[PDB]
Each structure stands twice: as structure tokens, then as C-alpha cells.
Design a protein around this motif. Structure first.
Motif, short mmCIF file in Angstrom:
data_model
loop_
_atom_site.label_atom_id
_atom_site.label_comp_id
_atom_site.label_asym_id
_atom_site.label_seq_id
_atom_site.Cartn_x
_atom_site.Cartn_y
_atom_site.Cartn_z
N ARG A 35 0.83 -1.20 0.00
CA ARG A 35 0.00 0.00 0.00
C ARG A 35 0.86 1.25 0.00
NH1 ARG A 35 -2.58 -2.78 3.84
NH2 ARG A 35 -4.20 -4.26 3.16
N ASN A 40 -3.26 -0.95 -3.81
CA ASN A 40 -4.49 -0.96 -3.00
C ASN A 40 -5.17 -2.33 -2.91
OD1 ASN A 40 -5.08 2.37 -3.21
ND2 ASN A 40 -4.08 1.39 -4.98
N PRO A 41 -4.48 -3.35 -2.42
CA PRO A 41 -5.03 -4.70 -2.37
C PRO A 41 -6.07 -4.87 -1.26
CG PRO A 41 -2.94 -4.68 -1.25
CD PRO A 41 -3.14 -3.29 -1.81
N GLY A 87 -20.02 3.72 -6.71
CA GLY A 87 -20.05 3.07 -5.42
C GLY A 87 -20.51 3.98 -4.29
N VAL A 90 -24.21 4.71 -4.42
CA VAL A 90 -25.01 3.72 -3.70
C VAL A 90 -25.51 4.29 -2.37
CG1 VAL A 90 -24.98 1.46 -2.48
CG2 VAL A 90 -23.72 1.70 -4.67
N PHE A 91 -24.58 4.74 -1.54
CA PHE A 91 -24.91 5.14 -0.17
C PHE A 91 -25.56 6.53 -0.07
CE2 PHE A 91 -20.89 2.54 0.20
CZ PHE A 91 -21.55 1.35 0.48
N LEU A 108 -18.67 1.50 7.01
CA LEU A 108 -17.21 1.28 6.89
C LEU A 108 -16.62 0.48 8.07
CD1 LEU A 108 -15.97 4.82 5.61
CD2 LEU A 108 -15.96 2.68 4.20
N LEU A 111 -18.97 -3.65 7.68
CA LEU A 111 -19.18 -4.35 6.41
C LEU A 111 -17.87 -4.68 5.71
CD1 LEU A 111 -22.33 -2.47 5.06
CD2 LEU A 111 -22.06 -4.99 4.97
N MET A 115 -13.18 -2.00 8.98
CA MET A 115 -12.10 -1.15 9.47
C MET A 115 -12.38 -0.67 10.88
SD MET A 115 -11.42 1.25 6.18
CE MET A 115 -12.98 2.01 6.18
N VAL B 668 -32.52 1.41 -4.18
CA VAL B 668 -31.09 1.34 -4.45
C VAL B 668 -30.68 0.27 -5.48
CG1 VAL B 668 -30.49 -0.31 -2.59
CG2 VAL B 668 -28.80 1.44 -3.34
N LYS B 721 -24.23 -6.04 -3.40
CA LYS B 721 -23.93 -4.71 -3.92
C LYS B 721 -23.19 -3.90 -2.86
N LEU B 722 -23.89 -3.55 -1.79
CA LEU B 722 -23.33 -2.71 -0.74
C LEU B 722 -22.00 -3.24 -0.18
CD1 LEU B 722 -26.40 -1.75 -0.97
CD2 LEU B 722 -26.31 -1.26 1.49
N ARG B 723 -21.82 -4.56 -0.19
CA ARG B 723 -20.57 -5.17 0.29
C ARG B 723 -19.45 -4.87 -0.68
N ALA B 725 -19.36 -2.47 -2.82
CA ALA B 725 -19.13 -1.02 -2.82
C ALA B 725 -18.23 -0.60 -1.64
CB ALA B 725 -20.46 -0.27 -2.78
N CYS B 726 -18.41 -1.25 -0.49
CA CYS B 726 -17.64 -0.91 0.70
C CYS B 726 -16.20 -1.38 0.54
CB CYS B 726 -18.25 -1.54 1.97
N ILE B 727 -16.00 -2.66 0.23
CA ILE B 727 -14.66 -3.18 0.01
C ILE B 727 -13.86 -2.23 -0.88
CG2 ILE B 727 -13.30 -5.11 -0.95
CD1 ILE B 727 -15.41 -7.06 0.07
N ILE B 729 -14.18 1.28 -1.32
CA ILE B 729 -13.77 2.44 -0.53
C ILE B 729 -12.75 2.05 0.54
CG2 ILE B 729 -14.61 4.36 0.88
CD1 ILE B 729 -17.47 3.48 -0.41
N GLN B 730 -12.91 0.86 1.12
CA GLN B 730 -12.09 0.43 2.25
C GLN B 730 -10.65 0.24 1.83
OE1 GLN B 730 -14.71 -2.88 2.97
NE2 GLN B 730 -15.20 -2.21 5.05
N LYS B 731 -10.44 -0.64 0.83
CA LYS B 731 -9.08 -0.88 0.33
C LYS B 731 -8.37 0.44 -0.06
CE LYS B 731 -9.13 -2.12 -4.50
NZ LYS B 731 -8.05 -3.13 -4.73
N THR B 732 -9.12 1.40 -0.58
CA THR B 732 -8.63 2.74 -0.89
C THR B 732 -8.12 3.49 0.35
OG1 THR B 732 -10.31 2.84 -2.67
CG2 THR B 732 -9.23 4.86 -2.18
N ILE B 733 -8.95 3.60 1.39
CA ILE B 733 -8.56 4.29 2.62
C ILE B 733 -7.38 3.56 3.26
CG2 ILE B 733 -9.27 4.93 4.97
CD1 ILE B 733 -12.22 5.07 3.78
N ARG B 734 -7.38 2.24 3.17
CA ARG B 734 -6.30 1.42 3.72
C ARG B 734 -4.97 1.81 3.08
#
Ligand SMILES: Nc1ncnc2c1ncn2[C@@H]1O[C@H](COP(=O)(O)OP(=O)(O)O)[C@@H](O)[C@H]1O
Lengths: 145, 750
Positions: A35, A40-41, A87, A90-91, A108, A111, A115, B668, B721-723, B725-727, B729-734
């Protein structure tokens, strides 16, 4: 793949993560490095390349840069922008780009690859007004660079 | 397909009946084993039975779990019901839940603040389906439908003994009392509830599984005037266990009152009655269980007598009852001695008989004569030893039945209203499917009754489904009715089990073994609801509504005989020292035929009403506060119709969203363009694309009707879907935060 100038830039970053002085890192740290070097894995993508290690060895197995490198490669040769915007679309229960703060933290932290709330805090630090709203577009560009 | 990685299931568990599991790898078709994860982590390879290739049941998605109504659940199957009722009970102290038109009530074994006046008002004048489930909600509906249809109501409360049927009734009354006007010197509630100790002494007994079981149906009718107000009540009894008066099996007593009499024997006022302890009398000793752990039978008498006092059985008449019961008890010990030409006689100056005749006030010799003789009409004839005994028991039983009816008639007098009655709501307090290891006639009778009742219920539900299906314009011929008439018929038609039993009875030579063979000849193979144990010729099996039940033929014939010699009754009718004993009394009668009669009488009463249903449930076996044993629970559901009712429901379209509701939770999933100005029409377009097979739902005026497992599928793709979509954003912030952590440590910040 990779040339000599890139091998030195990567090995420089790699020895910063060595907290012992053996030239190796923990299996867990392999994710961090990748990372750090622009990748970004998903934690799953990381685990495959490690061997899907059991927890008994994920906190104890050390690896030189020679063995780390194929793993850094493997993630390289498997990694759009529009689909990131869809993405967050969606929210979004309004259409105005403005998404709740409570409802973003929640998803976040409960799900997918969940994190910690602390990680989620340091990231969304100040990117939210009084109403608890955040224009994802602003946020999306920030996080990518 | 639906069994993907991360989706969960329920597998069997010796401890908790079912246990949760997660799929480690996607189920591939033709695979032999699944890869699962339990309550202590990833460990196990679940083997699929090669003959069925069938897969373990699926878990509902969390957003459907904890709901007020079981039919809301997509995957509607045994573990689902069992889990869903567990979490409400244990994690939210919620004891009431609907299963469609049924209210399930789980005994909390802890008093709750959900029965006071404030809560009564809140349910007052609301609709059922807009207030959290409550016994109160079922009451309100009854009081409503009453006026709205000029129709009396029956609230049918069923469940095993100790599940809280009695408590449920007690609160349905209080409601009806508080929400009516109240009557002054009546306060009916209080009088009726004082009746309970009485009815429990003459109608309840200790069994092998229950210390205080009702061996009858009680039906308290609540009477209402033209201006809908509580005026009076009217108790009706049915289905009494007459057999229990002269027979007990191991670890079971006769009806309480007998034991509240022996334990009160050394008391002054009860010395004429001349009673030993319980091992003395034949009609109380047979089980070997004279005392119930934690009950002072004598203090219960004190309470019994006190309740009689409160309902206006004059002390005189109280001694009237106990005296008759003492005699039944002495009657029992009358021994018979066989003499020439298959006959008998009573030993000279018989202690038991002398006391029986003294108490009743009848000529010793006239009775002794008629216990051993019979009027063949006009030549007198002797009777064998065994026929004298059957006839003694017939008389013990006959008397009790009448004394039992007498007490009810005079309890009624205390609960009767001068004011004329417009309408009533009757609460039935009845049993449910009994099923021990050894099943006999007593159980057979009970489950027979329960097949009558679960037939009314089946019908009722079928009519309400039709009505609802019409209100929404959906083809009304998509509702398969499950018809339990064949089973009823096996039991109660001619050439059926009770009829053959009634034949074999009036055969002089007849026995349980020949009756067993007559059942095989007549039914085995000719009928699929009847089977036979492979290694017995003394036991049958009926497949009832909920499950299969192996009865044991031993005992059936003697229990079923109930022929009283007319002469013996006349001797008692002609008494001059006892005002009550005559007051009781006003081819070949039998307990089974009698049972049948009372049964039909009851189903009439109940069919002249719209019935409501409360199923009570005991969750554990040691009176523990909010403690849910999965083994007990699941037993209690099966022998309660529930799981079967639900088994039926899941065949049709049990899920039911309005277009507004569907639209909200599934806006949605829709492509922004697909959305239209007409939201109803929008749903119609989206749902045909997302779920293909169009036999998987139906579109109605205001609601979509779904097949089972379908809403689950919506909630999987919505989850997918929502899962995903989260993965993202998450991997990005990580990554963002790892490079920020690098940029710092690169410039020696450590
Ligand atoms: N709703 C309830 N709240 C508190 N205790 C209850 C409740 N329902 C049942 N119980 C407890 O369970 C016991 C058995 O109650 P009961 O109504 O007599 O069962 P049943 O009459 O079917 O045999 C009662 O003594 C009571 O302590």
C-alpha cells in the motif's frame, strides 16, 4: 515488470518496515508495504499471495525482499475511476452528493473488510460540515492521491 | 446459486438442536461435502447424505430477524422459527409473537410490568396489526369483531400443562373487564378466579410429566349486554378423563381432591369420613406417587374449602361433596371373592363396604346384593368376578362425573347474572398433542380432540386467506388446503379405531390382542395414516397432524369400559340421610363414545363463534426465569401445530410487502432511469428483471405476494452490492493511510 532503479526504491521502503535488524519483515507487514508503494489490495488479495497463512504463522513468519518481491509483483499484475463514483452513489439517499457522517462510519466499520473506528476517524478528519454531510467527490479525489 | 461463500446455514447439534455455520467455499453442484465455520471458529467438513443430496437449511438475513410475525421471514423453517423466538425472548424480554393469526406466548417465569392499566389503554381501540403483540391485542380484536359482526367470540388458549394457558386467560378477562364499563358488586374477574382452586382439585392431576395437569377442557363464557358490558360468566366443562378415577399408571395420582382429603384425614370434622393415608385406598395408591414435591395437600384443601366458601357452596353442601368422595374412596376397596358357577360375593361384614354404606345412607344388604347380581330382563343372575369389578369402577366413575357436573352447576350460580345477555366471549382452556414414550387411551383421546380443533383452525385460516386474496385481486385457486378429515375418520368413523374398540368391548371373550389384530386386518395397508411397529403385534401408529404417535394397546379395553348397572344407581337414588346424593342423578355406554359425544358438543359451541388462537409454550423444565432450552422449545412447538402450520404457510406466498415498502428498501437496486412517476408501476418493472421466474410472486392492488426464499434473495443481492461497494472504498482508505504513514516515517518521525 521491474528494473533496477525500481528495485532500490522498493528495498528502501522495505527496510524502513524492518523493526528488528534482520533484513526481513513479518508476514502481516507485507500488506502495509504494498500500500505504501502505491497499491491498493483487498486484505484477501494480500492473503492469497502470502499462501493464505494460518494465524499461527501470520504473526511469526519473516521474509527477505527476495521472497516479498514476487508477492509485490503478484498484486501489481492485477491492478477504473468511474466505478468509484458509482459506489458512493449507492450510499446516497438524496442525489446532492451529500452523505451522512454517521451512516458512512457505520457501513465502513461493520461491512466487507471491516475497518477500526480509529482508522475511519483519521481519514474523515474535518471533511464534514455541521449537518454531518460530506461531498463524496471531494473525498474521493483526496483519498486517491 | 444461493449457497455462496459467507452465507450461513443451520446444521444439527445434539446440545442446542441447531447450530449456525458459515460457508468457507462456494457450494459447487454435485459436491459431496460443504466447508463450514462454527462457535469457536473455522473447523468442519459437513457431509451431505448421499441418498437425498439435500442441503442444510438457510439462515435469514438479519434485517428480517426479530420481527413481530414469523411469516415475515423468508426462509420459514424449523431453525428459523426457533432462533427468531429465542432472540426475542432472551435478548429483548419479549414473550409474545404472532404466527399469522396465532399468538405464541412463551412463559417468562418472571413477573413483568406489561399488564397494568396504562398498557391496557394503549391497546384500547387500536388495530391488531399496529401494536406490539400481546394477549391484550387478541382480547381487543375479540371485543371488536363482536360488535362489528353481532357474533360471539371464542379465544382458544392451547399448550402443554404449565405453559401459562391459565395466566393468559386471567389477563384476557382483566382486559374485557376494564374495557367495558365495569359492573359494581360483580367485578366478575375475582369470582371466576376463585373458581380456579376448585376446578383444579376435581379436574387436574399429577401425571408422569407434570405435577398439575388439567385432564379436561374448561370454557368460561364471558356474558355481555346490549350496551356491551361485563355482567356475568358461564363455565362449560368437556373431555374429562374418567378413567383416571379408578386407574393410575406409575408415578401418577388420581385427581387432586382425593389427596387433599387423605392428608386432611386426622382433622376433627373429617372423622366420620374415616380415611387412612393414600397407600390405603386402591383408587389413590396405584401410581406409587402419594405426595407432590413442594405441595402440602392439606393447605390446598384449606384453600379449596375457602374458595367453595367464596362461591356460596354452603358449609353443609361442602361436607356433602367430601362425603361422596370418601365413599368413592371406600367403594374402591370393596374386594370380591369368586364362588360357584362363575359368580362372586363380598366377604362377611366387610369393613370397606360398611363404611361406604354408612356414609351414603343405604341398606348394606341391598347394595351387597346388587354389586354381585344383575337384572336380566325378569330373572336375577349372578355376574363373574371381573364383571363385578368393571361395574364397581363404572359406578365410581359415574358418581364422580355427576359430582363434577354438580360443582360446576353451583359454581355457575355464583357467576350468573340477573341481567339478560346479548353476546359472549368464551375463553377455551384446553390441552394440545400429548406424547409420552408409552402412549395409551388417555393420550389417544387427547390427540383426537386436537385433530378436531386443528381442523376448525385449518378451515378458519383458509377462509381468511381467500378473503385477503380477493381484497387484492389474486387468483383464489392458488391456495392448497391440507385436509385432516381422513385422520379424524380413521379415529371416529364406523370401522375406525374407536368403533372397533367399542365392538371388541361387548365381546365376552374380547381382549387387547384381538382388538389389535382387528385394527391390522381392517386398516394396515388399506390406509396410509395407520402403521404397525415391525417388532410388535400389541401397538399401532397413527400419523397425526404434527407427528406420528405409537400407542400401546395394553389397557385400552378395560379403560374404555363404562357400563353402570341400573340397579346400583337406584340403591343410591333412594337415600334418606343425604340431600345431595340423589340430586346428582336425573347398547352399552363407553368412555370412548362418551368422549366423542362431548367432543362434538364442543365443536358445535365453538363453530357458533369466530375463534382466536393463543399457543402457550414452556421454554424450560425447571421454572427458570427467561431461560430458553432449545430441546424443550422445539418439542413444545411440534406438539402445538406451530411448525406444521408454518410448514403449510411456506408452500404459498407468505411474504407480503406493500409497493411503498418494497420501493423504499429496494430504490437502491434500481437503475436511475427505470424509476417512474408511478411508483407501483416501477416496482412491477424492476422485480421482473431482478427475479426472473414469474411464478415466484404475484402483483396485487396494494401489495406484492412473494414465495418463500424470495425476499431473502432480494436481500442477498442488495447485500452483495453494498458489500462490493464498501470493500472498494475500504481498500482505498487502507492505502491512503498507509502512504500517509510512510511519508511520515520516511522523514524520520520515529
Ligand atoms: N405471562 C406470565 N408472566 C409471569 N409468569 C407467568 C406468565 N405466564 C405463566 N407464568 C408462570 O407460569 C406458571 C404456570 O402458569 P399457568 O397459567 O398456571 O400455566 P397453565 O395453567 O397452562 O398450566 C405460573 O405459576 C406463573 O408463575
Amino acid at each position: 515488470e521491474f528494473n533496477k532503479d525500481q528495485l532500490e526504491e522498493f528495498k528502501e521502503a522495505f527496510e524502513l518496515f524492518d523493526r528488528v535488524g534482520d533484513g526481513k519483515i513479518l508476514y502481516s507487514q507485507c500488506g502495509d508495504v504494498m500500500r505504501a508503494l502505491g497499491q491498493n489490495p483487498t486484505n484477501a488479495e494480500v492473503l492469497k499471495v502470502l499462501g493464505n497463512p494460518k494465524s499461527d504463522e501470520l504473526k511469526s513468519r519473516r521474509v527477505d525482499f527476495e521472497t516479498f518481491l514476487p508477492m509485490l509483483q503478484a498484486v501489481a499484475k492485477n491492478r477504473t475511476y468511474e466505478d468509484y463514483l458509482e459506489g458512493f452513489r449507492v450510499f446516497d439517499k438524496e442525489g446532492n452528493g451529500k452523505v451522512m457522517g454517521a451512516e458512512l462510519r457505520h457501513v465502513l466499520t461493520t461491512l466487507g473488510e471491516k475497518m477500526t473506528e480509529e482508522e475511519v476517524e483519521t481519514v474523515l478528519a474535518g471533511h464534514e460540515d455541521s449537518n454531518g454531510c460530506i461531498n463524496y467527490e471531494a473525498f474521493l479525489k483526496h483519498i486517491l492521491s | 446459486e444461493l449457497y455462496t461463500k459467507y452465507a450461513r446455514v443451520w446444521i444439527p447439534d445434539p446440545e442446542e438442536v441447531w447450530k449456525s455455520a458459515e460457508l468457507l467455499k462456494d457450494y459447487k453442484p454435485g459436491d459431496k461435502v460443504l466447508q463450514l465455520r462454527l462457535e469457536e471458529g473455522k473447523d468442519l467438513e459437513y457431509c451431505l447424505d448421499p441418498k437425498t443430496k439435500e442441503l442444510p437449511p438457510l439462515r435469514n438475513p438479519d434485517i428480517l430477524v426479530g420481527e413481530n410475525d414469523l411469516t415475515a421471514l423468508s426462509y420459514l423453517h424449523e431453525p428459523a422459527v426457533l432462533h427468531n423466538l429465542k432472540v426475542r425472548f432472551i435478548d429483548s424480554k419479549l414473550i409474545y409473537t404472532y404466527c399469522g393469526i396465532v399468538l405464541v406466548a412463551i412463559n417468562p417465569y418472571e413477573q413483568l410490568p406489561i399488564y397494568g392499566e396504562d398498557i391496557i389503554n394503549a391497546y384500547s381501540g387500536q388495530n391488531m396489526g399496529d401494536m406490539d403483540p400481546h394477549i391484550f391485542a387478541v382480547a381487543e380484536e375479540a371485543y371488536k369483531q363482536m360488535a362489528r359482526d353481532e357474533r360471539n367470540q371464542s379465544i382458544i388458549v392451547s399448550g402443554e400443562s404449565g405453559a401459562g394457558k391459565t395466566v393468559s386467560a386471567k389477563y384476557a378477562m382483566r382486559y374485557f373487564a376494564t374495557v367495558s364499563g365495569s359492573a359494581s358488586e360483580a367485578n366478575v374477574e375475582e369470582k371466576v378466579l376463585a373458581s380456579n382452586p376448585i376446578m383444579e382439585s376435581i379436574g387436574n392431576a399429577k401425571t408422569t410429566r407434570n405435577d398439575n395437569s388439567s385432564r379436561f377442557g374448561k370454557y368460561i363464557e364471558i356474558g355481555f349486554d346490549k350496551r356491551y358490558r361485563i355482567i356475568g360468566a358461564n363455565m362449560r366443562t368437556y373431555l374429562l378423563e374418567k378413567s383416571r378415577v379408578v386407574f393410575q399408571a406409575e408415578e401418577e395420582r388420581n385427581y387432586h381432591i382425593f389427596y387433599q382429603l387423605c392428608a386432611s384425614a386426622a382433622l376433627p370434622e373429617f372423622k366420620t369420613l374415616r380415611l387412612g393415608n393414600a397407600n390405603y385406598f386402591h383408587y389413590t395408591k396405584q401410581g406409587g406417587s402419594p405426595v407432590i414435591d413442594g405441595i402440602d395437600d392439606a393447605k390446598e384443601m384449606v384453600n379449596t374449602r375457602q374458595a367453595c366458601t367464596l362461591l356460596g357452596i354452603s358449609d353443609s353442601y361442602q361436607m356433602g361433596i367430601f362425603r361422596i368422595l370418601a365413599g368413592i374412596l371406600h367403594l374402591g376397596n370393596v374386594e370380591f371373592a369368586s364362588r360357584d358357577s362363575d359368580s362372586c360375593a363380598i366377604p362377611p361384614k366387610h369393613d370397606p363396604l360398611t363404611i361406604f354404606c354408612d356414609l351414603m345412607g343405604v341398606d348394606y344388604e341391598e347394595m351387597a346384593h346388587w354389586l354381585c347380581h344383575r337384572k336380566l330382563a325378569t330373572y336375577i343372575k349372578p355376574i363373574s368376578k371381573l364383571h363385578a369389578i368393571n361395574a364397581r369402577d363404572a359406578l365410581a366413575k359415574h358418581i364422580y362425573a355427576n359430582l363434577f357436573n354438580w360443582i360446576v352447576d353451583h359454581v355457575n350460580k355464583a357467576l350468573h347474572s340477573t341481567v339478560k345477555q346479548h353476546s359472549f366471549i368464551g375463553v377455551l382452556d384446553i390441552y394440545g398433542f400429548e406424547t409420552f414414550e408409552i402412549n395409551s387411551f388417555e393420550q389417544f383421546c387427547i390427540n383426537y380432540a386436537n385433530e378436531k380443533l386443528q381442523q376448525q383452525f385449518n378451515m378458519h385460516v383458509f377462509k381468511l386467506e381467500q378473503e385477503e386474496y380477493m381484497k387484492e385481486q389474486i387468483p383464489w385457486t392458488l391456495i392448497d388446503f391440507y385436509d385432516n378429515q381422513p385422520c379424524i375418520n380413521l379415529i371416529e368413523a364406523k370401522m375406525g379405531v374407536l368403533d372397533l374398540l367399542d365392538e371388541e368391548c361387548k365381546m365376552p371373550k374380547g381382549s387387547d390382542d384381538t382388538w389389535a389384530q382387528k385394527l391390522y386386518n381392517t386398516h394396515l395397508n388399506k390406509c396410509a395414516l395407520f402403521e404397525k411397529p415391525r417388532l410388535s403385534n400389541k401397538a399401532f401408529i397413527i400419523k397425526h397432524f404434527a407427528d406420528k404417535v405409537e400407542y400401546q394397546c395394553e389397557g385400552f379395553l378395560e379403560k374404555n369400559k363404562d357400563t353402570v348397572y341400573e340397579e346400583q344407581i337406584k340403591v343410591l337414588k333412594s337415600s334418606k340421610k343425604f340431600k345431595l346424593l340423589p340430586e346428582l342423578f336425573q347398547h352399552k355406554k363407553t368412555v370412548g363414545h362418551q368422549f366423542r359425544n362431548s367432543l362434538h358438543l364442543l365443536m358445535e359451541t365453538l363453530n357458533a363463534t369466530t375463534p382466536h388462537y393463543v399457543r402457550c409454550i414452556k421454554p424450560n423444565d425447571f421454572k427458570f426465569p427467561f431461560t430458553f432450552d432449545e430441546k424443550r422449545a422445539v418439542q413444545q412447538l411440534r406438539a402445538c401445530g406451530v411448525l406444521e402450520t408454518i410448514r403449510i404457510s411456506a408452500a404459498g406466498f407468505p411474504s407480503r410487502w406493500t409497493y411503498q415498502e418494497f420501493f423504499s428498501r429496494y430504490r437502491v437496486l434500481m437503475k436511475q432511469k427505470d424509476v417512474l412517476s408511478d411508483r407501483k408501476q416501477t416496482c412491477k418493472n424492476v422485480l421482473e428483471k431482478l427475479i426472473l421466474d414469474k411464478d415466484k410472486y404475484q402483483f396485487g392492488k396494494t401489495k406484492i405476494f412473494f414465495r418463500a426464499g424470495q425476499v431473502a434473495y432480494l436481500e442477498k443481492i442488495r447485500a452483495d452490492k453494498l458489500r462490493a461497494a464498501c470493500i472498494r472504498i475500504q481498500k482505498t482508505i487502507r492505502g491512503w493511510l498507509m502512504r500517509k504513514k510512510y511519508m511520515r516515517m520516511r522523514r524520520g518521525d520515529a
